[PDB]
Each structure stands twice: as structure tokens, then as C-alpha cells.
Design a binder for these strands. Structure first.
Ligand SMILES: [Mg+2]
Ligand SMILES: [Mg+2]
Ligand SMILES: [Mg+2]
Ligand SMILES: [Mg+2]
Ligand SMILES: [Mg+2]
Ligand SMILES: [Mg+2]
Ligand SMILES: [Mg+2]
Ligand SMILES: [Mg+2]
Ligand SMILES: [Mg+2]
Ligand SMILES: [Mg+2]
Ligand SMILES: [Mg+2]
Ligand SMILES: [Mg+2]
Ligand SMILES: [Mg+2]
Ligand SMILES: [Mg+2]
Ligand SMILES: [Mg+2]
Ligand SMILES: [Mg+2]
Ligand SMILES: [Mg+2]
Ligand SMILES: [Mg+2]
Lengths: 97, 211, 117, 26, 41, 152, 45, 176, 202
RNA sequence: GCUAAACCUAGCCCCAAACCCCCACCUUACUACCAAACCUUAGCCAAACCAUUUACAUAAAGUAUAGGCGAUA
RNA sequence: GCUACCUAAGAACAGCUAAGAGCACACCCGUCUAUGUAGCAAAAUAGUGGGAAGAUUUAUAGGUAGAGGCGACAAACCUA
RNA sequence: CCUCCGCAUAAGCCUGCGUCAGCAACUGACAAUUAACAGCCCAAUAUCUACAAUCAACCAACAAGUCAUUAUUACCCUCACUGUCAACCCAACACAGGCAUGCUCAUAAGGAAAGGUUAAAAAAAGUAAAAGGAACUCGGCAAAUCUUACCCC
């Protein structure tokens, strides 16, 4: 019977956190900071998608090319198998042509 | 099992080598195993100084009026089962001896006024002061079932009880509490219960006969 | 078909159960006719002292005082055993101070351990 | 444990209707 | 399982409250109930 | 000694000498009937027959005459909650048979009856675990289940 | 008839699948090396 | 005599036998090498007594009279084993400067990993030892693939352990 | 003891703990706040005061300190009531058994002011690390416990197998450049005319 | 009212940073001790068969070129 | 480690009639029938039958490996 | 009342019906298998080894065979280590199966086909049968009794 019997402990969310009250600051650091920095230089994450958006094939092509020289040995083989699969899916399968 | 000998004789025979281990913490009691000197109902001013040596503000004359409010408030907490209130008025030698038999049944004990004023009889004494006080009061009882049907004593008629309630006090924060209740051998028998009782004889194996 | 149990001497066939023994040290050799010659010098001889009149008992009384741990370093053993015998011959070769470079003629060699325990 | 609150609240109020269909108050 | 269904109990009782007066397992088992509750409607 | 390398012996070398004997020993009561001169020990595995003769005559000064060793196999048939086998360790048993017609009988360590009686006050605590077990006040059946606290 | 294919012997079990025959050839050291990488309790017979 | 394997018969079955403290390591460093040699065969004769009583208590299905004094003599025979070994390693640094008593070298077996190979005593030199020459202490070009995979498998276990440790410290600052 | 073992009022190898913590239980770990090994200030014997729950405002001594759960077991206080001696037909006797208190719910008490005070571990010019209260600069000494074992260091008589203080401290060590092997061989007096022929180590 | 139900923290995933780690054991591994490594990947699959062929920072650019000039590269 | 063949060094074969002889045990094989068919058995049991001093059966250790091995060719057998 | 089994060794397995305790051999504590039997051997360098076995004697062979030292040098010590249990192994099982050798060739050893009742059908295994004797059937398969004769390959 997949439904819980006691109602869960209450989710207390501080809306005036440090990360919440100062969220969004310096997203316009270009257009009113004399264009020294782009806002794409403000995003922190992986190296291969710091300022770049693609589908799943274009992400694995970019991950193999940018950071794939220093990837682990069976993480590179799991990535090469994924590009070998997503090539065949996007180019040979599907409804529209 | 039945005893502590029969457990160790079975723990030895089963191979259960259980190690008697040493611990720094001991069981910190607050009562005694019964009465120090058993008063027998038909000079102890040493024990009133040994009480006054640790307490230093205590009058033997005031105490029978204190003894009534310990006795009366302990017995009114049986009508509601306020076990957190019995634990400050009744020592843990007396609390299982007035609550274990009365669980899952309701009592309607009620105090009407006494006949004789209470008076202290004897005083005795990690040290436990002990005061016996005689009570000649007037009480009613009505003990019931789980099902609410009367099993002992009528509710309106007040009865006459003669009581010698030994009191006790641990001597840093404890107070005077009920410890036990002396029942003499020459006491008249209690009120007969409302139902009839059968008592079985020996349960005989076929080889054993009745002699 | 068993894999995980420790391969002891109880496990193989007859030619297997003879060759492997438990951790006992060899003493002699076998010659022709499978006859074992026990070498007397390979047997470890227990150098036991005499305990008569000895006054150290296996426990220490609890009235004994406590101290601080100083492991015997090589500098401390030098400073007690050698350094005063240096100074008495300095105010007036090193093999006269217990220093021995080569230990080929020595019975209890220190490196590598020629003794037991 | 399925995360969420809105389904655990509704079941708490369907239990309280069944607690009055099993034991109706005076 | 990022978001799986937490309220599937109440979707079953939308159907099973109409089947309470049936026979057999049509009043209990949901798979047998919807083919009769639809057919009862 | 055990868990050490032994110095190698070439032909014509010095005597091998142990100075601080590493290994323990323990003599056991035999589970079967045995002769009056045979003492049974529990030898650590790497300790030979002749190393026990020099152990006992050297440390304890007893007249050992015949030593006979055997290896006991501890069972690997008992399992955890993880269903992994728990090996009771193997131990070498040795039967030391004494010389000059001597005779050893294993002593009665732990005499079963100490003075006369059961128990009282070994070290407060066990007082209430006895003086209410003789002050039990077993329930009189004539009362029929009524609580016996009230003096009424 | 069938099913009793295993006729055990400890000489032959050590001579085919023991630790010595694994490291006797370069293709069998990789057999040990895949056991240790997987984390097996027993790497050989 | 075999009576030394048991204690005094007035201690038989008293279920509490009094015993002093164990020998600490600092008290043994004041005694000579002859006296630690003589103390060792006092503690060994006591350790055989208490191990005898340990097996006899298990055979008699009873606890120990005092199981605290067995772990004292074990403590005194590791401290005495540590003091004599300290004067062993200190004299090794003076007479020859070596750190370990047994020779050895850092070698690299067929599985490519760096082991410390402790040397054994032989009689013939190594180049004509038939059994020693079958033991290969080099790794071939097929091992470096499995050397990388074991390095990354150790790297994953380490990065899991570091990451989990920070996730618990964020729970602690939440809860307090 | 396995990892994520749950500490309790019983010692971790007792037969009453092996019933509660058998080797297969995976219970939720208790999150305790990590006190440093030098930051802890309540010891076995300290005069403390209880803040929350039953017996609030009472002062007592500390019998146990279970450091793995930040507990203090005050003696005779914060008690519930349990029975021991329960056999097949006897009910057992009633005992006030005490509950542990977290260190947030217990404050140290000055032995002069008799008030719950805060504690700073001020270094002093004689004593290197002594608790000092905040309301007044009174040092609170690390008090005396009973012991660790049944030792009672003041009352100790030796037996025939315990050595005296004079034998335990007599410095017989004359340090030289000989081993224990080479010093016993000259005290016992064994000769060896044979020399050790050189073996190969490889 | 039985059977059961429910639970939340074990742990994990993805990134960023920072380059990781006494004794016995290659003989029958866990056994104290005796007279020689390097040499193209292939094929599925795509071409609707198959046979040459078929992928393994941004921008120039899917451009020049290649190709049963065809799939595609 | 079953099995096909080989190698090494072993072993086994009563009794009766007179040679890859006959009758016949142990042994090996499996003609025919019946039971069994989630069975005792992922090929067995009971009766019957073929050989049983040989091109025999068999214990042990070794050898040949899948683009192959082995094969008194059944395109058999090479861990159901 | 059954026994075409049993008892040892080999191989295998590894404490698996010993003590104490908890349809109508499991868990926990404790205890045992003691070497003479069997494993574990051999100092070099040369140099010796044509005539089987079969009661080995007659005979009779072909397939042509399982068995041996000396010379000189070196050498003088001794009894360590390991196996030793069981109702057991391989068959997923306390499986009618599989399993080498030595003795006993019906037992001195080892065992129990029936939980209790009733006496239906059908089914399985067996015994008996009038008169007939293959008319049965693809076929004398099966059973019961023993033989003749001829073809095909
Ligand atoms: Mg033996
Ligand atoms: Mg076979
Ligand atoms: Mg195609
Ligand atoms: Mg297609
Ligand atoms: Mg023939
Ligand atoms: Mg024939
Ligand atoms: Mg053939
Ligand atoms: Mg053909
Ligand atoms: Mg064909
Ligand atoms: Mg099967
Ligand atoms: Mg018989
Ligand atoms: Mg039967
Ligand atoms: Mg039946
Ligand atoms: Mg019928
Ligand atoms: Mg007829
Ligand atoms: Mg017809
Ligand atoms: Mg016809
Ligand atoms: Mg026929």
C-alpha cells in the first residue's frame, strides 16, 4: 500500500538565505560593467559546458574532445559507447526525415 | 526459569559462560528492603538526633499532620492512577505493593474523618530515617472489575481501619514517603469478598493416589 | 570444488599430505632409504637463566609512581655508552669504543640478524 | 519513501473520515 | 526515480468506490474492477 | 620461537639459541581416559616434538620421556548472519609422558562446592533481590484476587 | 547418466587451475589481474 | 615441576585473585638486559599458568577467576618485547646504520605493483638458484592497463570517501 | 564492534548490549554534535545542574560520561522506574533507574556559588589546563573519581606475585654496545668456538 | 483481526578542486634453506543485398577535398 | 576431472568344456518389453539380452582446443 | 525377516547421529584422530647392464617383454615433519544412479520392505487356470517351453 501513514516533517525553507537573497547578482555584469566580462564567465560547472548548450550527442562529443584526454579508463569506454550509440540513433532512427 | 540458582545451573550446563563484568555505575536506590527494626504492636531518642543531624529543621510533633497528608494524598492517587504523583509520596518498596494488584480495575476509595489523632510510635535509622505512625481512621472502599461490577466493599458504608504506616526519608532531595504498612498478627480478618472461591486439591498423576 | 578454505596439509592425496607441513622449522635432512638425520645444532636450545633469588615478580604494585615515555633512540644510547669514554680519551682509531665496521668474524651480527629473537 | 506532501496530507484526512466511520463521536 | 506517483491510492478509489457492491474480485481487485465499472457506466 | 626467521645452519656452524621464547603453552584436562604418566598439552603449531622436550626440561625442569604430537582440526562448519564460515583455529595437541615412573593427575581447579551454602552479599543490590523473594506474600486464594494493600 | 561430470582430485585441480599455471603464461596473469581488479576473495585454485 | 602451571592451591576457586599493575614500558627501560631476560621467564611461566586456567574455565563451563590478569601479563610481554627491540634497533643504527633487521628491496612483481620483498637466507648465490630464477620481479606491457584501472578504482573509493565526509558535515551544521 | 554502532547506557560488550546490538542491525545513526577531545568539560564526579524535563533545577553528581553520545548520567536524578528480578511467577522489585542527559541540558556548578555557570579552559601560570568559570574566576578542579578498576590506590597490599616499589625502580641498566644476546652469553658463560659462515640474502 | 503495512538515513550519482597508493607467498601461491617481453585489430553494423567503403574553447566549416563521386567520410 | 584418441607406469578377469574359442560369474555394454515421464534418475528401475584372456575392461598422472582437437565417419564427441 | 552385501585401503569430502544444553544428521558450549603403517628420500664423476613372464622344470612360442653394478673420491650424524575422526564422495537433496583395489563369497559383518485401517474401480508387479493351443498380432511382442529347415545381407 504505497502511501505513507504519518505526514512528513515540515520543510522549512529560508527564503532569505545567502544563496537566495544574493541570487542573480552580476548577471548583467556585461551591459553595465563596461563589457569587460561576459555573463557566461559567471557560471560554474563542468569545463566542457561553461557557456554552451547542446543535446546529448553534442555534449558527449564535446566532453570527449575537451576533457576526454584525462578521463578514467572505463568512463571513456562508457562515453565512446554512448557516442557510438547516439550517432546511430540520431542519424538512422526516428520518425521525421 | 524459577530461581537464580536454576538459571546458572542451566547456563553452566548449556555452556553459556556469561562473564560477571565490573561497571563503575551502581544502582542508586532510595528505599530499603522493608523495615529496619520490625515494630510489634501490642526510648528511641537516639534516632531522632540522627535524623536531626542531617535534616536540622524537623519537629516530631508536627509530623502526624504531615503523615496524614502523605497517607491521604497517596490514596486519592489510586482513584485516578496518577503514577507520577505516587512516586513522590510513596517509596518504591510500597508502590508495587499498592498498584500492581489494582491495575485494570477501578477503585473508589474515599476518606471520611478519623476517630483518633495520629501519633508517632517508634523512630529508627546512604542513611534512611524511618518513622512509624499509628492511624485510627475511617475509610470506605469500592473495588471493581474491568467490567465495572463491584467486587469488594460497599460504596457508602464507612469502615474502621487500624493502621501503622512506616514512613521513610532518604538522608538530599527526598521527602517523607510511605514505605510499608504494618499488619499485626492479632488483627481482625478483613471484609469477605462478594464471590465464592473454589480451591483445587492436588493434581494427581495416575500413579499417585490421594492419601 | 572448494575454493575459500585454507589449503592445509590435511587436504590433498598421500603425496600431497607429506610435502606440505605446518609452520614447524626444519631440523635435518633425509638421506637414502628415507632416513632422517637430525642435526643437533639446528635445534634451538632454550637459554634459560636461574630464577633463584630473583626479585622481580610478574606484576608491579599499584603504589609505584608513573613516568613519561622515552623510547631509546640511537642518540641516547650513544650519549650514555660512548660519549663519556670519548671525553676521557679526548683530553689526554674508533674500534676501541665498541665500533665494529665489519661483522664477518662476529657471532651475533646485527645486520642482517644472525641471532634469533 | 515517495517524496512529497500533498498526497500524505489527503490520506491523513481520509483516515480521519474512516476514524469517524469506525468510531463516530457523541 | 525523480518524480514517481505519490497519489496512486486515490486514483484507485475513484474506481473502487463504484465497485463496492459487486461480486467476486470485481469489488476488490482494480484490474478486474475497471472493466466492470466502465461497463456499469 | 615463532614468527621469526631462523638463522641458517651450514655444516660446522654455531649452535642455534633462542633467548626469549616467543611461544606459550597450556596443559589441558584430557577428554578421554589416559595413563597416569601422560600429561596433555596444547602446543602452538610451529613447535616441534623436540622443541617441547627442551621447553619443559629447560623452563620447568620436568623429566619428559616421550612426546607425541597431533594436529587437531577446528571445524569450518558454523556460519555468520552473512553465511560465511567461521573457522575455529587448529591447535597442536601434545602428549608428554613423564619419566622416572612419575605420575600426574590433573588438579581440581574450581572446587564445585566452596563452603556450604548458596548466596548472600557478594560485594545494597542483592538484598532486595532476596528479602522480597522471602517477603513475597503469595496470593491467598481465599481473597479471590482482591488487592491486599488496603487495611479494610 | 549425465550430471556427474565433476570427478574431483586435488592433483589435477592444482595442475589445471592453480596459481602456478596461471602465472606460467602471459595470458593467465591477466586472468589473475581481472580477479584482483574485480576484487575476488580467491584469485585461483 | 608441573605444579608451576597452576598457581597456589589456596587460590583454587576463589573467583577473585588480586593482582598488581602490568609492567609499563618505562619501568622496563631501567632494568638491564640480564634482568629483562630473567623477567621474561617469570612472565612466561605466569602466562602459561593463566592460559591453563583459561582453558580449564572453558572446560568447566565457568568464567575466569580474574580475566583481567591475563591481559596484564600480555601487556607486560609486549612492553618487554618492545624495550629489548628498541635497544636492538638503536644499536643497529650505531653499528651499521640500517633501519630494518632483515634485508630487502623495493621490487615490482608480475602484477605491476610495488612490493617490499623481504630477503631469505640461502646457500648458493642467486644466479644459479633454480627456484629463485623462476620468480619474475618485472611487469610486462600487458600490466600497465590493469595498473591504471586499479589506480582509478582506488581513486573512486577515495573520492567517494571525501565527498561523503563533506555531506555529513553539512548535515551537522544544519542540525546544530 | 561494527561501524555505525549505536552506543547506549550499557557497556559495549556486555550481555545486555549484545541483546540490543546484535551483529546484524543497521539502525539509524544518532547525529551528535562533534565536541573536540579537549573541549569536553564534564567528568565522572562533577557537580552539575539539570535544566530540562523532570527534576529541573536539581543539582547532583555525575556517575557516567558516555562520551560517544555527549551524555551525562546524573546520579539519582532524571529517573524513571523499572523492575529487576522478574521471574516466571514473581513480579520483581521497583527501582528508580536514571536516564542520560545531553551536555546542552546540564551546566557545571561552582563549588562556592552553587549556580550553573559557563566554562572556559583558561591556561594558568601554575596549572596548564584548568576549568575556570565565567561568572567568577573560580577554578573548578578535575575531581576525584572512584577508580578505573577495583584498585583503590590508597589501600593496596601486595601478594606473593606483585613486586615492590624498590625492585621496580632499581636502575640496573648499564648501557653498552652489546645486545641482550651477547650480554646473557657472558653472564651465563657459554662458549662458542664456531663462527657463523656467511649466507646469501636475496 | 491475522497476514501485512507504513518510516529515513545508511550510502551513492554528477561535478569542481587537488596528480594517487612480525612471519609466509611464482613449487601444489600463502611452502625457512641448493648447480624469457615487443609482430596492422577484426567484425557486427550503414550502404535498405553485398563484394571498394562506413564517424571513434569558439570560428573558418560541414567549406576545400575524398567516395561502388554513393552510403557517407 | 564428462567424453573422443594417445602417452607413461599399474591392475583386474571364478568355475566348466577344449583359438580376437564355446557355456558362464564378477565386470563392461545396452537387444527387447514393461514401469517411470516435474520420475529414484535433466535417460533410471525390474525382467531379458551381447561380450567377458581380449581390437578387453579399468584406477592414476600427462597430452592434443574452437578458422581447431579428436574420429574402427555416427558430419559422432570435445563438462547435461 | 532381508543381504549381489560387508570390512579396510586409495581417491574424495573436511568435523558432518561423541558428551552437555536447545511424521515424531540442526544450533550453541566442550571434547577428540598420539606412529611402528603411509607419505616426505638418494654426494659426485665415469663405467656396467644379449638370454622375458607363465609354480619355470619339461614342452611350446610370438605380440619379444615389469625388475641387476663396479671403480675411486666424499661421508660418520640419527627417528624430525605431515596424514590418522565420522553415518562421508560425484549426482541441486539424508537422490533406486555413478565409484578403483584387498579380503570374506554367505556372512562373526551390515540392515528393515508394513504410520494406522479398510479390501471399491482403474493402474503396476507377480502366481494359478477348464477345453483349445498363435485362432492374437504389423510381428509368437510378452509369457511359457524348446527345436526343425531354408533364404536375403
Ligand atoms: Mg603423527
Ligand atoms: Mg574418470
Ligand atoms: Mg547492410
Ligand atoms: Mg534497416
Ligand atoms: Mg572369447
Ligand atoms: Mg561367450
Ligand atoms: Mg572408437
Ligand atoms: Mg555417412
Ligand atoms: Mg548425414
Ligand atoms: Mg541430478
Ligand atoms: Mg547382523
Ligand atoms: Mg518401512
Ligand atoms: Mg499406507
Ligand atoms: Mg483391478
Ligand atoms: Mg489355460
Ligand atoms: Mg486377425
Ligand atoms: Mg493370424
Ligand atoms: Mg520372446
Amino acid at each position: 500500500i504505497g502511501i505513507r501513514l504519518t505526514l512528513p516533517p515540515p520543510k522549512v525553507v529560508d527564503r532569505w538565505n545567502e544563496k537566495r537573497a544574493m541570487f542573480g547578482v552580476y548577471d548583467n555584469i556585461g551591459i553595465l560593467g563596461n563589457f569587460e566580462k561576459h555573463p557566461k564567465e559567471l557560471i560554474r560547472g563542468p569545463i566542457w559546458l561553461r557557456g554552451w548548450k547542446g543535446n546529448e550527442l553534442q555534449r558527449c562529443i564535446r566532453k570527449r574532445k575537451m576533457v576526454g584526454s584525462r578521463m578514467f579508463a572505463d568512463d571513456l569506454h562508457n562515453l565512446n559507447k554512448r557516442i557510438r550509440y547516439l550517432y546511430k540513433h540520431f542519424n538512422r532512427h526516428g520518425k521525421f526525415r | 526459569f524459577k530461581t537464580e540458582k536454576e538459571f546458572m545451573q542451566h547456563a553452566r550446563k548449556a555452556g553459556l559462560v556469561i562473564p560477571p563484568e565490573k561497571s563503575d555505575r551502581s544502582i542508586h536506590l532510595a528505599c530499603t528492603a522493608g523495615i529496619f527494626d520490625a515494630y510489634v504492636p501490642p526510648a528511641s531518642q537516639v534516632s531522632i538526633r540522627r535524623i536531626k543531624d542531617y535534616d536540622a529543621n524537623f519537629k516530631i510533633k508536627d509530623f502526624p499532620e504531615k503523615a496524614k497528608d502523605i497517607f491521604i494524598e497517596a490514596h486519592l492517587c489510586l482513584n485516578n492512577s496518577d503514577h507520577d504523583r505516587l512516586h513522590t509520596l510513596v517509596t518504591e518498596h510500597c508502590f508495587p505493593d499498592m498498584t500492581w494488584d489494582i491495575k485494570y480495575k477501578t477503585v473508589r476509595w474515599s476518606f471520611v474523618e478519623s476517630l483518633e489523632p495520629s501519633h508517632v510510635v517508634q523512630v529508627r535509622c546512604n542513611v534512611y530515617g524511618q518513622i512509624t505512625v499509628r492511624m485510627h481512621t475511617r475509610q470506605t472502599l469500592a473495588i471493581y472489575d474491568r467490567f465495572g461490577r463491584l467486587m469488594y466493599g460497599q460504596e457508602d458504608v464507612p469502615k474502621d481501619v487500624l493502621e501503622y504506616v512506616v514512613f521513610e526519608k532518604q538522608l538530599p532531595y527526598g521527602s517523607w514517603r510511605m514505605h510499608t504498612k504494618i499488619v499485626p498478627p492479632w488483627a481482625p480478618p478483613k471484609q469477605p469478598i462478594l464471590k465464592t472461591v473454589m480451591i483445587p486439591g492436588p493434581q494427581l498423576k495416575p500413579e499417585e493416589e490421594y492419601e | 570444488a572448494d575454493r575459500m578454505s585454507k589449503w592445509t596439509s590435511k587436504r590433498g592425496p598421500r603425496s600431497f599430505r607429506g610435502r606440505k607441513g605446518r609452520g614447524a622449522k626444519g631440523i635435518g635432512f633425509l638421506t637414502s632409504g628415507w632416513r632422517f638425520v637430525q642435526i643437533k645444532e639446528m635445534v634451538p636450545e632454550f637459554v634459560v637463566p636461574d630464577l633463584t633469588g630473583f626479585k622481580l615478580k610478574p606484576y608491579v604494585s599499584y603504589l609505584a609512581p608513573e613516568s613519561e615515555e622515552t623510547p631509546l633512540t640511537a642518540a641516547q644510547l650513544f650519549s650514555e655508552a660512548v660519549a663519556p669514554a670519548i671525553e676521557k680519551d679526548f683530553k689526554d682509531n674508533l674500534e676501541k669504543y665498541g665500533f665494529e665496521p665489519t661483522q664477518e668474524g662476529k657471532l651475533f651480527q646485527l645486520y642482517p640478524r644472525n641471532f634469533l629473537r | 519513501v515517495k517524496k512529497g506532501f500533498r498526497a500524505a496530507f489527503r490520506f491523513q484526512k481520509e483516515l480521519e473520515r474512516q476514524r469517524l466511520l469506525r468510531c463516530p463521536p457523541p | 526515480l525523480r518524480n514517481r506517483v505519490t497519489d496512486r491510492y486515490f486514483r484507485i478509489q475513484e474506481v473502487l468506490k463504484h465497485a463496492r457492491h459487486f461480486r467476486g474480485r470485481k469489488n476488490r481487485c482494480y484490474r478486474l474492477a475497471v472493466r466492470t465499472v466502465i461497463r456499469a457506466f | 620461537a615463532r614468527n621469526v626467521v631462523y638463522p641458517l645452519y651450514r655444516l660446522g656452524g654455531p649452535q642455534l639459541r633462542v633467548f626469549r621464547t616467543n611461544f606459550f603453552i597450556q596443559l589441558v584436562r584430557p577428554g578421554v581416559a589416559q595413563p597416569e604418566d601422560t600429561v596433555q598439552f596444547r602446543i602452538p603449531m610451529e613447535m616441534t616434538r623436540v622443541d617441547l622436550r627442551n621447553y619443559l626440561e629447560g623452563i620447568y625442569n620436568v623429566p619428559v620421556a616421550a612426546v607425541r604430537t597431533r594436529v587437531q582440526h577446528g571445524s569450518n562448519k558454523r556460519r555468520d548472519h552473512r553465511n560465511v564460515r567461521i573457522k575455529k583455529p587448529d591447535y597442536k595437541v601434545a602428549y608428554v609422558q613423564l619419566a622416572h615412573g612419575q605420575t600426574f593427575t590433573f588438579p581440581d581447579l574450581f572446587p564445585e562446592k566452596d563452603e556450604s551454602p548458596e548466596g548472600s552479599a557478594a560485594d545494597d543490590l542483592y538484598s532486595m533481590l532476596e528479602e522480597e523473594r522471602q517477603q513475597r506474600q503469595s496470593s491467598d486464594p481465599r481473597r479471590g484476587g482482591v488487592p491486599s494493600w488496603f487495611g479494610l | 547418466a549425465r550430471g556427474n561430470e565433476y570427478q574431483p582430485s586435488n592433483i589435477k585441480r592444482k595442475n589445471k587451475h592453480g596459481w602456478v599455471r596461471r602465472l606460467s603464461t602471459p595470458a593467465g596473469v591477466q586472468v589473475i589481474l581481472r580477479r584482483m581488479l574485480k576484487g575476488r576473495k580467491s584469485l585461483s585454485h | 615441576g608441573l605444579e608451576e602451571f597452576f598457581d597456589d592451591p589456596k587460590n583454587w576457586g576463589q573467583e577473585k585473585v588480586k593482582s598488581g599493575a602490568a609492567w609499563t614500558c618505562q619501568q622496563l627501560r631501567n632494568k638491564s638486559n640480564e634482568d629483562l631476560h630473567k623477567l621474561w621467564y617469570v612472565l612466561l611461566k605466569e602466562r602459561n599458568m593463566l592460559l591453563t586456567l583459561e582453558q580449564e574455565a572453558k572446560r568447566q563451563r565457568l568464567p575466569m577467576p580474574s580475566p583481567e590478569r591475563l591481559d596484564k601479563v600480555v601487556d607486560s610481554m609486549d612492553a618487554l618485547d618492545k624495550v629489548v627491540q628498541e635497544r636492538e634497533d638503536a644499536l643497529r643504527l650505531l653499528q651499521t646504520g640500517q633501519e630494518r633487521a632483515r634485508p630487502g628491496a623495493w621490487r615490482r612483481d608480475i602484477f605491476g605493483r610495488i612490493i617490499w620483498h623481504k630477503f631469505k637466507q640461502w646457500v648458493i648465490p642467486w644466479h644459479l638458484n633454480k627456484r629463485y630464477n623462476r620468480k619474475r620481479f618485472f611487469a610486462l606491457p600487458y600490466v600497465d592497463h590493469f595498473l591504471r584501472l586499479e589506480r582509478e578504482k582506488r581513486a573512486r573509493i577515495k573520492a567517494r570517501k571525501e565527498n561523503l565526509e563533506r555531506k555529513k558535515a553539512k548535515i551537522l551544521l544544519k542540525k546544530f | 564492534l561494527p561501524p555505525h554502532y549505536r552506543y547506549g547506557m550499557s557497556p559495549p560488550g556486555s550481555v545486555a548490549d549484545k541483546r540490543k546490538n546484535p551483529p546484524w542491525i543497521r539502525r539509524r545513526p544518532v547525529v551528535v554534535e562533534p565536541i573536540s577531545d579537549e573541549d569536553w568539560y564534564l567528568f565522572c564526579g562533577d557537580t552539575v545542574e539539570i535544566l530540562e524535563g523532570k527534576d529541573a533545577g536539581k543539582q547532583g553528581k555525575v556517575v557516567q560520561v558516555i562520551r560517544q553520545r555527549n551524555w551525562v548520567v546524573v546520579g539519582g536524578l532524571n529517573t524513571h522506574y523499572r523492575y529487576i528480578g522478574k521471574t516466571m511467577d514473581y513480579r520483581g522489585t521497583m527501582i528508580p533507574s536514571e536516564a542520560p542527559l545531553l551536555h546542552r541540558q546540564v551546566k557545571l556548578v561552582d563549588p562556592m556559588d552553587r549556580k550553573p555557570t559557563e566554562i572556559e579552559w583558561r591556561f594558568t601560570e601554575a596549572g596548564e589546563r584548568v576549568r575556570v568559570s565565567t561568572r567568577s574566576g573560580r577554578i573548578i578542579p578535575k575531581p576525584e573519581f572512584p577508580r578505573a578498576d577495583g584498585i583503590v590506590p590508597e589501600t593496596w597490599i601486595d601478594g606473593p606475585k606483585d613486586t615492590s616499589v624498590e625492585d621496580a625502580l632499581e636502575r640496573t641498566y648499564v648501557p653498552c654496545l652489546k645486545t641482550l644476546q651477547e650480554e646473557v652469553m657472558e653472564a651465563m658463560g657459554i662458549k662458542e668456538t664456531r663462527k657463523y659462515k656467511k649466507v646469501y640474502w636475496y
